[PDB]
C-alpha cells in the first residue's frame, strides 16, 4: 500500500475527506491514515469546515461537503484546497487551488529526495469579494463558469492565466492556481510514503 498520514494542524476542526478513503472528523492535533492499494492510479484528499453531524454521519459542511455524509464517497462542494496524487511510471502530485481555497495544506513525501508542495498562505484574508464565500474562495472558473478560466474548449490547449489565477498564484506559488498552471506537479519515484498537514508551519 501507499500510506497518507493526514493531520490537522489549525485551531479549529477540519473533517477531513478522500476520494479514495472516506472522511474522518479531525479536531485540533488528530490524523487519519489512508492506505491506498499500490495499483490505485489516484486520490483526491481535502478538508471540509463548519461542519454537522448526526449519530447516523448525516449533516451538512459549510466548505467541501460530500452529498452531506460524514464518509465521503462523492467530490466535495467548492470551495477546498485539495491535495492531488496520481501514480504511473512514478508518482504524481500537487496542492491545487483549480476548485478554490478554504484550509491552507501541504503535502509532504516521506522520501526526502522530492519536493513537499505546500500552499501555507491565509488565501481567504485576500479572497476577492466576488469569488468569497461563507469559510473559503472560490476559484474563477467556480464562479464564472466560462472557458477562460476553466481552460475548456477554445481554450483547452492554449490557457492563458488571468487576474484571478494569479492572485491564487502568488499567495502559493507551488499550487496549481488553475487548469493548465505549469509550475505545480512535483514527482516522485513510487515506493514512498506521503504526510498532508492542513495548516503546515513556516518559517
Ligand atoms: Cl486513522
Ligand atoms: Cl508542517
Redesign the pocket.
Known amino acids: 500500500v501507499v500510506k497518507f498520514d493526514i493531520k490537522n494542524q489549525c485551531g479549529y476542526t477540519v473533517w477531513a475527506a478522500g476520494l479514495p478513503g472516506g472522511g ?1 472528523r479531525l479536531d485540533q492535533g488528530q ?3 489512508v492506505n491506498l492499494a499500490a495499483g490505485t492510479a489516484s486520490a483526491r484528499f481535502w478538508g471540509r469546515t463548519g461542519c454537522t453531524f448526526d449519530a447516523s454521519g448525516k449533516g451538512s459542511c459549510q466548505t467541501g461537503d460530500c452529498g452531506g455524509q460524514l464518509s465521503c464517497t462523492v467530490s466535495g462542494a467548492v470551495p477546498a484546497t485539495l491535495a492531488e496524487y496520481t501514480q504511473s511510471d512514478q508518482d504524481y502530485y500537487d496542492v491545487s487551488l483549480v476548485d478554490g481555497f478554504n484550509i491552507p495544506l501541504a503535502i509532504q513525501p516521506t522520501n526526502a529526495q522530492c519536493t513537499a508542495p505546500a500552499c501555507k498562505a491565509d488565501i481567504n484574508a485576500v479572497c476577492p469579494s466576488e469569488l468569497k464565500v461563507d469559510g473559503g474562495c472560490n476559484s474563477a472558473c467556480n464562479v464564472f463558469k466560462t472557458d477562460q478560466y476553466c481552460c475548456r474548449n477554445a481554450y483547452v490547449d492554449n490557457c492563458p492565466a488571468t487576474q484571478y489565477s494569479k492572485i491564487f498564484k502568488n499567495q502559493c506559488p507551488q499550487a496549481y492556481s488553475y487548469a493548465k498552471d505549469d509550475t505545480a506537479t512535483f514527482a516522485c519515484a513510487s515506493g514512498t510514503d506521503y504526510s498532508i498537514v492542513f495548516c503546515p508551519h513556516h518559517h
Open positions: 474522518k490524523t487519519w491514515t
